Structure formats: C-alpha cells, structure tokens
Design a protein around this ligand. Structure first.
Ligand SMILES: *[C@@H]1O[C@H](CO)[C@@H](O[C@@H]2O[C@H](CO)[C@@H](O[C@@H]3O[C@H](CO[C@H]4O[C@H](CO)[C@@H](O)[C@H](O)[C@@H]4O)[C@@H](O)[C@H](O[C@H]4O[C@H](CO)[C@@H](O)[C@H](O)[C@@H]4O[C@H]4O[C@H](CO)[C@@H](O)[C@H](O)[C@@H]4O)[C@@H]3O)[C@H](O)[C@H]2NC(C)=O)[C@H](O)[C@H]1NC(C)=O
Ligand SMILES: *[C@@H]1O[C@H](CO)[C@@H](O[C@@H]2O[C@H](CO)[C@@H](O[C@@H]3O[C@H](CO[C@H]4O[C@H](CO)[C@@H](O)[C@H](O)[C@@H]4O)[C@@H](O)[C@H](O[C@H]4O[C@H](CO)[C@@H](O)[C@H](O)[C@@H]4O[C@H]4O[C@H](CO)[C@@H](O)[C@H](O)[C@@H]4O)[C@@H]3O)[C@H](O)[C@H]2NC(C)=O)[C@H](O)[C@H]1NC(C)=O
Ligand SMILES: *[C@@H]1O[C@H](CO)[C@@H](O[C@@H]2O[C@H](CO)[C@@H](O[C@@H]3O[C@H](CO[C@H]4O[C@H](CO)[C@@H](O)[C@H](O)[C@@H]4O)[C@@H](O)[C@H](O[C@H]4O[C@H](CO)[C@@H](O)[C@H](O)[C@@H]4O[C@H]4O[C@H](CO)[C@@H](O)[C@H](O)[C@@H]4O)[C@@H]3O)[C@H](O)[C@H]2NC(C)=O)[C@H](O)[C@H]1NC(C)=O
Ligand SMILES: *[C@@H]1O[C@H](CO)[C@@H](O[C@@H]2O[C@H](CO)[C@@H](O[C@@H]3O[C@H](CO[C@H]4O[C@H](CO)[C@@H](O)[C@H](O)[C@@H]4O)[C@@H](O)[C@H](O[C@H]4O[C@H](CO)[C@@H](O)[C@H](O)[C@@H]4O[C@H]4O[C@H](CO)[C@@H](O)[C@H](O)[C@@H]4O)[C@@H]3O)[C@H](O)[C@H]2NC(C)=O)[C@H](O)[C@H]1NC(C)=O
Ligand SMILES: *[C@@H]1O[C@H](CO)[C@@H](O[C@@H]2O[C@H](CO)[C@@H](O)[C@H](O)[C@H]2NC(C)=O)[C@H](O)[C@H]1NC(C)=O
Ligand SMILES: *[C@@H]1O[C@H](CO)[C@@H](O[C@@H]2O[C@H](CO)[C@@H](O)[C@H](O)[C@H]2NC(C)=O)[C@H](O)[C@H]1NC(C)=O
Ligand SMILES: *[C@@H]1O[C@H](CO)[C@@H](O[C@@H]2O[C@H](CO)[C@@H](O)[C@H](O)[C@H]2NC(C)=O)[C@H](O)[C@H]1NC(C)=O
Ligand SMILES: *[C@@H]1O[C@H](CO)[C@@H](O[C@@H]2O[C@H](CO)[C@@H](O)[C@H](O)[C@H]2NC(C)=O)[C@H](O)[C@H]1NC(C)=O
Ligand SMILES: *[C@@H]1O[C@H](CO)[C@@H](O)[C@H](O)[C@H]1NC(C)=O
Ligand SMILES: *[C@@H]1O[C@H](CO)[C@@H](O)[C@H](O)[C@H]1NC(C)=O
Ligand SMILES: *[C@@H]1O[C@H](CO)[C@@H](O)[C@H](O)[C@H]1NC(C)=O
Ligand SMILES: *[C@@H]1O[C@H](CO)[C@@H](O)[C@H](O)[C@H]1NC(C)=O
Ligand SMILES: [Ca+2]
Ligand SMILES: [Ca+2]
Ligand SMILES: [Ca+2]
Ligand SMILES: [Ca+2]
Lengths: 388, 388, 388, 388
C-alpha cells in the first residue's frame, strides 16, 4: 500500500452528473434508520463512503426528540459505503459532535470532537487506533470541517476553529501523519472568520473554501502549503456569493480580500473550486433560507472581484425543497483528479415543525467532462407520513 | 486481474434448472424490504448479483403508494448478492430510473439514467467512480436495457433508446472502456423499434434480443460487432413470438426481417438466444397479460421464418400467477458459456388493486445440459396478507 | 487453494463440548427472523456455516401459517456464518425443499431439490454457478441428506433417495467434481431403506449413518469407497438404537445387518460414528417423540450386535424440551479430524398448536478430548410470548 | 501471519481520550437490539471488536424479562466490530455465561463457560474450531475474566476461578497455544480472592488487576510469568481503592499485600495499570453503588502503600448516571503499547425497576500522550421511553 499524492491535473468539467442518493428519510418511515445531520463523503481510492454525525437514536424512536441541541455526548460519527443508508448495522467509528475524515492511501484518519462546549477534546483515530488528542485552545467549541480532510504523501491536513461563532476566533491548521499531530499553523491572511471548511487537493498543496459566520456572505478561502506549513487566506472573488444568508445577486459583492459585510452572520457550510480564472460553486437557491441548491461556473469568478457572469447552471434541488450543508470531495480517475459534492437535505426542525426531530438525507453529484440534462433530486419524504 | 473475453463455446442446453428465488413480497409482510421493479442479474465471474430499480421506499411504509409513476428522482439502482433480498442494508449504487450493469473482469460498470423525461442524464460509473455522462439526444426519455450489459476484452456495450415508445425512435449502441464512452453507433438494419435489450456475449461479438413497442409482437434482434462497431438488426424468425401482447400461436407470424404488425404495441422486456438454427426463448403464458412464464426451444426458430415446432417446454410460473419482465445473463463455466434468465414477478398495481403499491420478487433459472422435472415458482405472497 | 483430503486420524473423543447456539425462536419474538426447518452445519476450513430450508417467510408475518406442507416452491436454502441467526440479510443460496452442502477446499457445493413431488429437479451449484441437474428417477420425491456432503481430493459424494417413504425405494450415491456428476452408484448391501444420511470423511473413504423409515428403528450405515465407487451398507450394531420411534432400551435390538422390525416407521434424521469397536451416537431421549437429546458411547456398539453397555452419556437437551433432526459434521484440526453435531430444536407444530407455524433453532456441540460437565441447552422460547 | 509479542514499551499517558460509544439502549427503543451485559473490547491488530454476553433475546421482546438470573443456557458471546451495535446480524461466537477472548496475531481465541452451576464446561475455540474443554474443578461456578485475555508469542493466558464468591476459592491461570491448554498454574501469592481479572501485556509477561469479592475493597494483582508459568499476587498499593463497595477516601486503605477488610464483599469488575511507581486506575464515583466513573493517576500508587495523592482526574460518566463493569484492553501503536478501557453502562434492574429487563451500553476511552478537556458520556436513554 502507498500514500496518495493526488498528483494529476484537475479534470476538465462541463458541469456535474448524478452520482448517489440515500433516501434516508423516506426509508425512516418504514425501517429503523439513524437520525443524523452534517453528512459528508470521502473515498478510499475509488471506494466511496458516506459519513454523518448520529444523534444516538433512530428516527422512529422517542429519543428522536429535539436534535436541535447540536452537541451531546450521544453523537457518534457513522460510516457506511456510499449509498448504504444508516441502518442499525452502521459502524459508529468515534464519539463526535464535529468531525472530519480522510484516507491517506494506506488507512483512514478520523478527527472526532466531543465533550463540554468550554473544554472539548479532539481524538485523532488512525487505522482504527487512537493516536493523538488535543484539548480546546480557546475554550469555546473546538470544532472542525464536517467534510473530508486531505492527505498528500502521508501528511493529512485539517482545519479547526475554537472561539466565537460571531466575532474573531482562533483557527488553526493541523498537519497529521499516521494519526500523530506533527505541526500546527495558525490561520494567516485576510480571511476574518473560518467555519466548516470544504478542502481539496491541489497538488502539491491543499485548498479550502469555508464559511464566514461573522461579517461575510462571500466565502473565505484557505491555501495550505504542504511543504512549509505556510497558510494564506482571502475570499472567493465572485460577486455571486456562496453563503446563506446573502444579498440578492444584483447587490451582492466580494473584493477577493475582505468579508463583504453583507448579511454576514450566520452562514451555511458550502464549497467552491477554481479552474484557472473561473470558479465552480454551489449554493442554496434561496438567499435567506437553506432551500434549493444550484451549481454554476462564474467566468472570472476566481480572479476578478465582483464577477457575475455565470454559465453552466444546474439545479440540484428545486427551491420548493429543503437543502442544508454541502461539501466537496475529490476522486482520482485514470488521468485527472475529479471534484464531486454532496448536499445535505435537512428535514424536520426548525422549518418543519410537525415532527420534533431533525434529520437529513443526501444527494451526491460528481464532475463530468461529458453532457447532461436537467432535474431535481430532493429528499422526497412526505412530512405527514413520518412518525413525529 | 484480467478482462473477460467470454471466448468459449455456448454450452449445450437441454433446458433450464432452478437457480435462485428471493421471496421479496412474502418477506415484505414481516420485514423492511425495498419496493422495486425492473430487476436483473449479473455476475462478477461466478459471483452473481441481483439488481433492481428501487422506489425510494420500503413496502410497509406510507411512501409505498403509487409506484406507477415510473420515473421519479427517488429511484436508485440496488445491488445485492443474488439471493439476498433487498433489506435496509442494500447498497444504492447510483441514481436511476433506467439502468444496465456489467462486470468487465476487473470492475463493475453501471449505466444509470435519471432526471427529467425531456432532458435526462445518463451517468457511467466504473469501479465506483463517475467516469462519463451523456445527455438526452432526442429529449424523450433517454433509457436503457434493464438487464446486463456485456464486455469483451475491456470494451463494454450497451443499447440505449431516446424518443417515442410507439413510433420511430433513436436507438444507439455505446462502446465503453473503463467507464469512458469511446464510440457510439446508431442502430442499423431492419429492426424498427428497440426497447429494453437482453444482450449476451457471442464471442467475439454481442447479440441482443429486445422489445419492439411499436409494430412488432415478434422480438427484434441486434448484432453488435465489437471489432468494427458495426450494427445490424432483424427479428427473431420464430412464428411463436415472444412479446406480450401477441396473437395466439395459430395466427402469430414473423418473417425474420420486419415487425409483424400483430398487436404491435406495447410489449414486455424479454429474451431469446440462438443455438445454430434453433432458438431458445421465454415468454409470458398469457398472450394478453403478464401472467405465467414458459420457456421452450423452437426447431428452426432462429433461421426459418414462421417455424412453430417447439420442444423442451418448461413452465417457470403457472398461468394463474403474475410474471413481468425477463432477461438474459451469461455465466462462463469451465468449458462453455452458459445462458441463464430471471423473471420479475410483479405484485400489486395495476392487476392487483387491493394494495396501492407495485413491487416484485424474482425467480432465476440457468441453462443445464443434464435432466430435470417440472414445477411452478411464483411469487407466493397472499395479497390479503400485505400492508396496503 | 487446494482440495481437502481429510487425511488425518479421527480425534480421540471423551465426549462433546458446547460450540454454538442461535436462539432463533426467542429472537423471532422481537425481530424479523426466517421461518426454517432441517438445519445443518458445514465448514469452509475452520470457518463454519449454518444452513437451513427457509419457508419463504419470517416468523412474525401472516405467511408463517402452515409450514407443515413440507415442500413448496417458496423454500430456499439459507446460509449464514455459524451463530448468525437467519435475519433479513441472509443469503438464499438456491431453491430447495431438500438439500446438502459441502466445501471441497476450493469452493462450495450445494445440492438443491425443488419442484413437483412426482417430477422434482436437483440443481448442483458449485462456486456460485449452476453446473449440473438431474430429474427424478422414481417420480416420488427425489430427496437428499439435509446435512453436509463430503469431498475428498476434489470429489464430493452425496446420498439421494427417490421413491416410497414406507417401502423399498431407489437410493443412489452421486460422485461430483466441480459441480459436475461424474458417477452414480446404486445403493448396495443390506440396508433396506435410506433417508437423510449424516455422512463423514473416513479417509480415503466416506461413511454415512442414515434413517430407515420403513422397517428399522436401528440406523442404516453406508460405506462409500471413493477410489472405485463401490457401495456397501448394513446397520449400526448397537442394541441401543438411534431412531425415533423405537422400543425401550430393555427390548430394542440390532443384528448389524437387517432392519430390526421394531417400530420401523417412521423415523428422525440422526447420526453416529465409529471409534474402533465402539460407537458414539445421539438420539432423542423420548422413544416415542422428538423430545430431548442425549449422546453416549456404546462399548462394542460398532462391531457387536445388540451391545448395550453405554458410557460417557451427556444430556444435550432435557426431555422436557423439543428436539428434532440431528446431524454430523467434521472439522479438521491440527493433528486430527474432529466430529461435531447439531440438533434442530423444533417449535410450533404439531406438538405446540398454540401458534400455526413451525420453525426451529439450533444447538451445536463438538468432540473434545478434554473434560466437561453437565447441562441442558433447549430452544428456550416461551410459546405464549410468540406471535401466532 | 505472525504471533503478537507486544514487545514495545508502554506508551506515556497523560490521561485518556474518547474512543467509542455504542448507544445500545437508546437504539433499543427503536430497533431490534440484543439484551446484553458483561461487555468488553479486544482488537485484532488495530481492528477492535466489541464483545458481550447476550441474554438470548432482543430488548423489545417479551423474553427480555428477568435477565437477573445471570447464568442461563440461552447466553452466547456476541462479537461485532467496535461501534457496531448488537443488531440481529450479530454473530454469537460460542455458548457462554462467562467469557474471555483474545487474538494471538494469527487467530481469535474464545474461552466460553456454560452449563450447570455445579458442573460447568469451558470450551476453548480457536480460529473458529473447538480445540479443548475443561470441566469444573470445584463444582461451584467455573468462571473467567469478562475481558480480554493476553497472548505473547503464540501463548495465551487466562485467569479462571471456581468456588465461593465470598470465601476462599480455587483460582488457576491457564496457558493455551492454538486453543490447546498446555499448562495450568494454581494462583500463588498474597491475593486472597480473585474474580473477573483485567489483564494486559507487560512484555515478556502479563499482569492482571482483578476483583476481590471476599475481604478486599482494594484490588488484587496477579503477575503471570510467561517463560516459567510462575504466578505471584498481591494488591494494588493505592489507598484510593478501586472496588465498589469501599470506604470513603479519607478512611480507605491498602497495604499492598492483603485484603484491606473494608467493605470487602461484594465488588465490581475493574482495572488499573502501573507506570513506574504510579498507578492509573478507574473506579465508580459512588463508593456504594455502580454509579459514575472516574479515572486518575495515584502518585506512588503502585509501590507505596496507602498513597492518596491523585492527579489527572477525568470524569468519564457523571455520578448521576449508571456505570457497571469496566476493563482494560491494550493496543500496540507504532512505537509503544497503549492502554484503553471500556465502561459498561447498565440500565434496568435492580436500580431502575420501571422495566423488568437489564441491559447495557458501552463507552470506551484510550490512553493519550496529548491533551484533552472534560465531559460526561453516559448511556443516555430515558428509561420512560423504553419498552418494559
Ligand atoms: C437540458 O439540460 C441542459 C443542461 O443542463 C440545459 O442547458 C443549460 O441551460 C442553462 C440555462 O439556460 C445554462 O446556464 C445558463 O447559462 C447562461 C449563460 O450562457 C449563455 O450566454 C453566454 C454569453 O454570456 C454564452 O457564453 C453562453 O455560451 C450562452 O449563450 C447564464 O446567463 C444563466 O444564468 C442566468 O440564468 C439562470 C436561469 O437560467 C439564473 O439562475 C442566473 O441567475 C442567471 O440569470 C441572471 O442573469 C441574467 C443575465 O445573464 C439575467 O437576465 C437574470 O434575470 C439574472 O439576473 C445560466 O448559467 C447552461 O449553460 C446550459 N448548459 C449547457 C451545457 O448547455 C438545457 O437548457 C436543457 N434543455 C431545455 C430544453 O431546457
Ligand atoms: C417431467 O418433467 C419432464 C421435463 O420437464 C417433462 O418432459 C417434458 O415434457 C414436455 C411436455 O410434453 C415436452 O415439451 C413438449 O415437446 C413437444 C414436442 O416433442 C415431441 O414431438 C417431437 C416431434 O416433433 C419429438 O421430436 C419429441 O422427441 C417429442 O416426441 C411439443 O409439441 C410441446 O409443445 C406443445 O405442447 C405444449 C404443452 O405440453 C404447448 O404449450 C405447446 O404450445 C405445444 O402445443 C401446441 O402444439 C401442438 C402441436 O405440436 C398442438 O397439438 C397443441 O394443441 C398446441 O397447438 C412441448 O414443447 C418436453 O420436451 C419434455 N422434456 C423432456 C426433456 O423430455 C415430463 O413430461 C414430466 N413428466 C410427467 C409425468 O409429466
Ligand atoms: C458432572 O459432569 C460429568 C460429565 O458430564 C458427569 O460424569 C458423567 O456421568 C455420567 C452419568 O453417571 C456417565 O455416564 C454413565 O456411564 C455409566 C457407565 O460408566 C460406569 O460403569 C462402567 C462399568 O460398566 C465403567 O467402565 C465406568 O468407568 C463407570 O464406572 C452408564 O451406565 C450410564 O448409563 C446409564 O445411566 C444413564 C443415566 O445416568 C441412563 O440414561 C442410561 O440409559 C444407563 O442406564 C441404563 O443402564 C443401567 C445399567 O448400566 C440401568 O441401571 C438403568 O436403569 C438403565 O437400564 C451413563 O452412560 C459419564 O460417563 C460421566 N462422564 C465422565 C467423563 O466421567 C458427572 O456425573 C457430573 N457430576 C455430577 C455431580 O453429577
Ligand atoms: C478542562 O479539562 C482539563 C483536562 O481534563 C482539566 O484539567 C484537569 O483538572 C483536574 C481537576 O482540577 C486535575 O485533576 C486533579 O489534580 C489535582 C492535583 O493536581 C494539583 O496538585 C499537585 C500538587 O500535589 C500538582 O502536582 C499539580 O500539578 C496540580 O497543581 C488533584 O488534587 C485532584 O483530585 C482532587 O480533586 C478531585 C476534584 O477535582 C477529587 O475528586 C479528588 O478526590 C481529589 O480531591 C480530594 O483531594 C483533595 C486534596 O488533594 C481534597 O482537598 C479534596 O477535598 C478531596 O479529599 C485531581 O486529580 C487534572 O490534573 C487536570 N488535568 C490536566 C491535564 O491539567 C481542566 O480543569 C478543565 N478546565 C476547566 C476550566 O475546568
Ligand atoms: C418533545 O420535546 C418538546 C420539549 O419537551 C415537547 O414539547 C412540549 O410538549 C409539552 C407536552 O405536550 C407542552 O406542554 C409544551 O408546551 C411543549 N414544549 C414546547 C417547547 O413546545 C414535545 O411535546 C415533545 N414531543 C414528543 C412527541 O414527545
Ligand atoms: C394512495 O394514492 C391514491 C392517490 O392519492 C389515493 O386514492 C385516493 O384516495 C382518496 C381518499 O381515500 C379518494 O377519495 C380518491 O378517490 C382516491 N383516488 C384514486 C385515484 O383512486 C389513495 O387513497 C392513497 N392510498 C393510501 C393508502 O393512502
Ligand atoms: C392458518 O391456517 C389454518 C388453515 O387455514 C386456519 O385454521 C382455520 O381457521 C378458521 C378460521 O378461524 C377455522 O374456521 C378453521 O376451523 C381452522 N382450520 C383448521 C384446519 O384448524 C387458521 O385459522 C389460520 N391461522 C391464522 C392465525 O391465520
Ligand atoms: C416479568 O417477571 C416477573 C416475574 O414473573 C413478573 O412480576 C410479577 O408480575 C405478576 C403479574 O403482574 C405479579 O402478580 C407479581 O407480584 C410480580 N412478581 C414480582 C416478583 O414482582 C412481571 O410481571 C413480568 N413482567 C412482564 C412485563 O411480563
Ligand atoms: C514523500 O515523502 C517522502 C518521505 O519523507 C520523501 O522522501 C519524498 O521525497 C516525498 N515525495 C514527494 C513526491 O514529494
Ligand atoms: C485485447 O485488447 C488488447 C489491448 O488493446 C489487444 O492488444 C489484444 O489484441 C486484444 N485481445 C483479443 C483477444 O482480441
Ligand atoms: C488426487 O487426485 C489427483 C488428480 O486426479 C491424483 O493424481 C492424485 O493421485 C490424488 N491424490 C491422492 C492423495 O489420492
Ligand atoms: C517464540 O517462540 C518460538 C517457538 O517456540 C521460540 O523458538 C522463540 O524463541 C520465541 N520468541 C521469543 C521472542 O521469545
Ligand atoms: Ca456568513
Ligand atoms: Ca410489441
Ligand atoms: Ca425408522
Ligand atoms: Ca470487594
């Protein structure tokens, strides 16, 4: 077995093609299925897995009530092959109310954060063993990506934050080999607030697009130099911004450098990635709520501030249906590294109060250099058919 | 690992022997089992899998209602080892309301079609990665085999149609290596309408027997030359025709060349295969409805128009029980390539209106050169014992 | 991978030690568990599997009613790792209302009989492929061991019967290589009626102890010469006889040669094996009903007619609890071939009429050359706690 | 494959980090989950498994009643990957109302004890085969560790007791190679009563910390010399004692040598391990009941009698929540052997009489040389949401 280097060029993409869907909520009305949120996808070579933070209960179960307390000690990181819904045979890989996982080519790394808000612990589990742990540096919800980390030549990087969700916080970028923390770099550069980073390999380095929960409806970007541990940061240039909430398209802005001070707080986990001067990005359709999901390319959107010329739009979820978090993962093909993304389809609270629980299903799409059509792939459950 | 070539002669067959049965509907009355239709079987060397298009729900689940809308965004391709019913641990391999899968000797290819009727996407998933995609060329339900594709020396072929279900359409034959489309040949020859092809290796080439939904109750045949991408087509010679609906045996015909204009529309997915001048074929027992299932050999049925001398008949399902789609798969033994087939046993709508759902079980038989007796292997559920 | 030869001496045994128990019926009152009967155990090297004939339904399911019609087309052979109860993820390996399985060192052989009573088919499935089939030779319930077959150097032998259950029938011994029947020897010697053989390797040959359903409460024995296909047969010498029904111990007999004409019909599947002049054997405790289960050694019981001096008795199931079929399997250890046995614990019909179904759990014991104590390991379900 | 030697130094530990949690009881309110008690953890290299003694039933099942009869013939040893709750697909590895398991680097050893209290049998299952068995030597509940055994260079050791739970008994230490007992050493030294040992590798030997159920609330220690089979024994020096019941911290004692005669009977399974002159240990928070769980290091606690200076305390379960048994397991990392522990979280009888059953969930922590914070990780079920 060999370490992944991801040393191929990024695939050409013309858009995205449907890849996977788990139908979790529909199934939960006639089967024992885990209550989850904050899902993601990561792959051991070409074999892809779905992950989520469990609420320590199934859906048709009185313990499903009030999974709006985001951090309890019952929460565990679930891991199944992609497309296998979270049934009762699902492995709980670690104790976690925040996580990130990734495979280095030889084994799985899981970063799992649990415990008290003011004094949390992160456990680093590598090839099934507990190798390292760190306590909270700012005593205010030590927390991480909720999507895949990335490893290059045996070194894995993960972004973590500790401190305020609505003011300056303390973000650090960890470098980890075989589960062991070998270096920690504080955040540097012009990003002013970092949450829930969606990271990808850009060989020899890593790049992340995150969520600013303080002043920005434009998404921050982090560049992680794997050879010297140097961090820089800025904001995606596109004037079509990726966060929710945000201004409408005619009055949204980004200068590439600073938070835009437009509906800055709070936010939603999301992603984008560069292709030369252009950016491919997803976002909720609604500017206000986590409703709908669309992807498009912004011409000049990576290098020209305030660019708003989109092309290759695709609806992933129509705006009559609920979305949620979204994130990037990468898959190395024969000749190029592809980019894929998942969308969390949140059902139940706070937007659907008939039920008392909150859970999600997923839909997943991957980059394509071929052709495609149109559609919409929402959760599909009828809230009136659900146990409450 | 090496590519399959299937370069052995076809096995001698005297008829078929019982191979597999999943009892899906019986179990659905006391267990959480997927609602499915359009099943098939395909094997990774000798290890055989059952596939179907899920309806995004289990049977005992209010979401089971009205799975007569054949194409929704909840539909996913399920894949289990043959004989493992579609329980909640079943992997949803792709998003699909039409599919075909096959193993090239090194990995699995899935062809998955989803999205809007007028602008569908097909995704090509190979070894678990999205490698290619194509959009609809005629904007009218891009669709494929609902049974296994076939690969020879690393090149896989699949038949797809886009356009009218009851008039001339646009059928193309794709050639795919490691998930990538390398060539596309339009249909050519005298077949006038193609649906739901049942294809098999006939080394060095592939042969398919399909469904004509327009003018033919005789089944069209497609020959796919793997070395030069040349396509020819015609109709099975046998005067005992394989489609449903059809004329009764005394007044059914086929000239080997054209649709017979006997009860031409619609049809049912089915199969047949050649042995020298004779044809082995299945069909529903009823000429009108998808009831019963029988197999037999027609002497001269491959090369002599209107031949009606059958022999070696076997009842698979008696005519008091529901059948459905059927298809071919091939299995390479020590010395010869065998032919096998599955029958979809459809329960619920439209023929059984007590329930509101529609789902299926399967029975599976393989060619034998030994001896055998008689029986009937229907679904076996009692519709009055089912949740509605 | 290499063929099993089983070419080590039989282990010394002082009795048997507890090995496995599945608790199937207890679990069926709070879980979806298959209705089964006729279980057995066979091992791929040291990895052991449990097998049974399913009734095409779970227990808490209205289709569980009247599983006293022993042969229907819903019956399939289930196969799980030993100790894994028959949950909804269980693989249905073939269509079968009678079976035998065995592993040749390279792959699994399953012999599966289904279809009409008067014209049944047996399918021979090897490494997951249908390799051969035979039809009924006497048109009266072609049927087989319901326990493991045995393979030596790539040749597997299985005993089958076709004809009367209460008069002379036609028993044949099949020799099968890679799923293909290569020879068939009619039964020969003094056994007069053969059912449900429990067979084991006695290198270079195989030996079986069966059930006589016609005139014998003594068990018949079959010796199968693997080098020349020669069959001989006789009866276990022990005057403590192994069938049920039988005379009480003071008035039971066997002359080693003929059926004893004591309560000859019907019978129960069982086992015994030789150790020099002595026999180790199990049997129901009750002489009349399938209640209780005991093992013991009979001194001179292999070679001296009417020997009744037992020693090393063990209760497996006390006589207040239901038993059922029992059978032998063998496991090769470091230095010797061990003998093990399972007992079917039948619950529900005809002895427990509160429920309408009939199903079983299992208990399993293996030979030991160490020491042991006492106990009783019955099914343990409370019939009043079961769905009906 | 090679035998484990565990020949690396013990890892530095600063405390423990969260590792695993199964949420068994919460899930049992909305899913079919095994009723268990006496869980433990053991790992095949870095791949960790959870084990427990099943009660032959799921929780939502009328058979769940009165699982306070600790030893019945329905009890089996369950084995799943760590973090996979005991769902209906769980394998029952042996028949057991007391057990110990361990992996020698090549295969799994299970020590399983079942049968009558006065004449029990222990079965020794290695690589899936029954290799040996021993009967009861004192005819009074032959019994063992309820946590992992330990193997060095192919020889596995396990501690067993037979005789009184409240007076002198007969404890022996078995040495087993490939499932075969090769030596048995009686207990020797100053420990006066041994139950439920928690053992770990201390290369080239093994060390155990057990439960004294007779006169001691200090925990006995056993040292097992693997080269010469020599046994010595004593008591953990710490004046902060590990058993429950016990005196409060101001009046608890231990002289390193004898039972302390402080609330000597009964006890709870627990663990401790040495680091030079200091001891790391867990215990219930309550001195009286199996409530809460804490870990800490006692300075001089290994070598100085009555030392009470603790440091590095961690709450694992707060004192408002139920605990239970706890035990040690060891995991070899790149450079050192780590120590981990599990806590059984018992719900239902006798402390929670609303329900009629008794079952448990688990939480699991591993040693760390990094940093960490605080929290509490109790079972988390609401007893009023459970079926009774
Ligand atoms: C079957 O399926 C295919 C594949 O999904 C689908 O084709 C895709 O259609 C969409 C929608 O038309 C295309 O995406 C749009 O692209 C245009 C720009 O492309 C054109 O113009 C530039 C010149 O600048 C050329 O280079 C280029 O080659 C094209 O001529 C964007 O302008 C679109 O964005 C606007 O419209 C969206 C709604 O469609 C809005 O959501 C978005 O916010 C934008 O609107 C805003 O800007 C407008 C001014 O531009 C303004 O008028 C609005 O009010 C608002 O302020 C969008 O990105 C996509 O590229 C097609 N993909 C491919 C590969 O061809 C087919 O349409 C479909 N078939 C059928 C029958 O429907
Ligand atoms: C135990 O199980 C075995 C194996 O399943 C079973 O044997 C099989 O029996 C069937 C039924 O008889 C056989 O299949 C039939 O074969 C005949 C042709 O074979 C004869 O004639 C030709 C001469 O041309 C010889 O070469 C040959 O050797 C035979 O002598 C077909 O004619 C049959 O088809 C007709 O009958 C079917 C009903 O059985 C109809 O469904 C079908 O539509 C055909 O009827 C039509 O054609 C007739 C004119 O031919 C006309 O009269 C009718 O009205 C109608 O228009 C069928 O293919 C099969 O080959 C046997 N298989 C083997 C391997 O031997 C046993 O019968 C069974 N045992 C018992 C006791 O039942
Ligand atoms: C803890 O657990 C152990 C292991 O399970 C257990 O030891 C086992 O006990 C049983 C029961 O005693 C033993 O099995 C019996 O063996 C005797 C023969 O052995 C003795 O005699 C011969 C001389 O011929 C010596 O060679 C030998 O070494 C012994 O001295 C059998 O006679 C027994 O069978 C009769 O009794 C059974 C009931 O126990 C009946 O079911 C059976 O039908 C037999 O009864 C019939 O025959 C009798 C005449 O023999 C007649 O009187 C009756 O009415 C009837 O017609 C049985 O096979 C076994 O060997 C022991 N195993 C070992 C390894 O030692 C301990 O007993 C147990 N501890 C406690 C406290 O109970
Ligand atoms: C975020 O999370 C971290 C990591 O969990 C946590 O830090 C940990 O705090 C605990 C609690 O303070 C520490 O454990 C205690 O250690 C002291 C000893 O350490 C001091 O003293 C010695 C000098 O001997 C120095 O070597 C050392 O460096 C320290 O200065 C123990 O005394 C503690 O035990 C007592 O208190 C416990 C309650 O906390 C009682 O349960 C226990 O029974 C002991 O009390 C008894 O003894 C007392 C006499 O000593 C007596 O007064 C009492 O009445 C009673 O009889 C305990 O072991 C631990 O080491 C810290 N860990 C690390 C790695 O730093 C943070 O506190 C947390 N953050 C926040 C904001 O809370
Ligand atoms: C679950 O959670 C909430 C909080 O406990 C419950 O909502 C309360 O229900 C009670 C009793 O019906 C009311 O008196 C309160 O006014 C409700 N509180 C709130 C904040 O709305 C809810 O009832 C529970 N749901 C279920 C299904 O058990
Ligand atoms: C499933 O779907 C169909 C369509 O929604 C429902 O059938 C209707 O039921 C209503 C209310 O009982 C009737 O008034 C309509 O006449 C029915 N429509 C048709 C087209 O027959 C059906 O009721 C739903 N079934 C279940 C079990 O919910
Ligand atoms: C299942 O099987 C048997 C046969 O159908 C049923 O027994 C009959 O029940 C009916 C209606 O209650 C009675 O009138 C008959 O006298 C019964 N027949 C016999 C042969 O006893 C039984 O009721 C069915 N059981 C269930 C639970 O559905
Ligand atoms: C579970 O087991 C116990 C013992 O059988 C049962 O407790 C008894 O219940 C009966 C009937 O309600 C009472 O009259 C007795 O006084 C109870 N006995 C004791 C010792 O308390 C209990 O009822 C059974 N529980 C269930 C749910 O069936
Ligand atoms: C990968 O890391 C190794 C080990 O430190 C180093 O020697 C090697 O140069 C690296 N490979 C690349 C492609 O940078
Ligand atoms: C299989 O394809 C390879 C690679 O292109 C080719 O060189 C070879 O000739 C082919 N084999 C056969 C049997 O046609
Ligand atoms: C096993 O069978 C082979 C192949 O036919 C034969 O040559 C060989 O002698 C046999 N081995 C034994 C031990 O009989
Ligand atoms: C392990 O056991 C082997 C086989 O008996 C022995 O020869 C060898 O010396 C042992 N290794 C160690 C490290 O003691
Ligand atoms: Ca924001
Ligand atoms: Ca037609
Ligand atoms: Ca008999
Ligand atoms: Ca004590």
């Amino acid at each position: 077995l060999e370490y992944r280097n991801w040393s191929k060029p990024q695939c050409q993409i013309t858009g995205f093609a449907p890849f996977s869907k788990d139908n979790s909520i529909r199934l939960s009305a006639g089967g024992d299925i885990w209550v989850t949120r904050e899902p993601y996808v990561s792959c051991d070579h070409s074999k892809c897995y779905q992950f989520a933070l469990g609420q320590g209960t199934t859906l048709n179960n009185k313990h499903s009530n009030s999974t709006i307390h985001d951090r309890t000690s019952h929460r565990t990181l679930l891991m199944n092959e992609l497309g296998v819904p979270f049934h009762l045979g699902t492995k709980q890989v670690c104790i976690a109310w925040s996580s990130s996982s990734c495979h280095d080519g030889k084994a799985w790394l899981h970063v799992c954060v649990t415990g008290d808000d003011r004094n949390a612990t992160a456990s680093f589990v590598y090839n099934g063993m507990l190798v390292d742990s760190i306590g909270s540096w700012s005593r205010n919800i030590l927390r991480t990506q909720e999507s895949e980390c990335v490893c290059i030549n045996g070194t894995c990087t993960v972004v973590m934050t500790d401190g305020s969700a609505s003011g300056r916080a303390d973000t650090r970028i960890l470098f980890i080999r075989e589960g062991k923390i070998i270096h920690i770099s504080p955040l540097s550069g012009s990003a002013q607030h970092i949450e829930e980073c969606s990271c990808y390999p850009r060989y020899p380095n890593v790049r992340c697009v995150c969520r600013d929960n303080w002043k920005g409806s434009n998404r921050p970007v982090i560049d992680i130099n794997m050879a010297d541990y140097n961090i820089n940061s800025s904001y995606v240039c596109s004037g079509l911004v990726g966060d929710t909430p945000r201004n409408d398209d005619s009055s949204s802005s980004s200068n590439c450098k600073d938070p835009n001070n437009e509906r800055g707080n709070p936010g939603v986990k999301g992603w984008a990635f560069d292709n030369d001067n252009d950016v491919w990005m997803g976002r909720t359709i609604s500017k206000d709520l986590r409703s709908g999901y669309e992807t498009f390319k912004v011409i000049g959107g990576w290098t020209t501030a305030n660019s708003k010329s989109q092309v290759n739009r695709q609806v992933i979820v129509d705006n009559n249906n609920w979305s949620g978090y979204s994130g990037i993962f990468s898959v190395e093909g024969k000749s190029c590294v592809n980019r894929c993304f998942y969308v969390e389809l949140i059902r139940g609270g706070p937007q659907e109060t008939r039920v008392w629980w909150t859970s999600n299903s997923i839909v997943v799409f991957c980059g394509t250099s071929g052709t495609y059509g149109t559609g919409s792939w929402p959760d599909g459950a009828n809230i009136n058919f659900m146990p409450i």
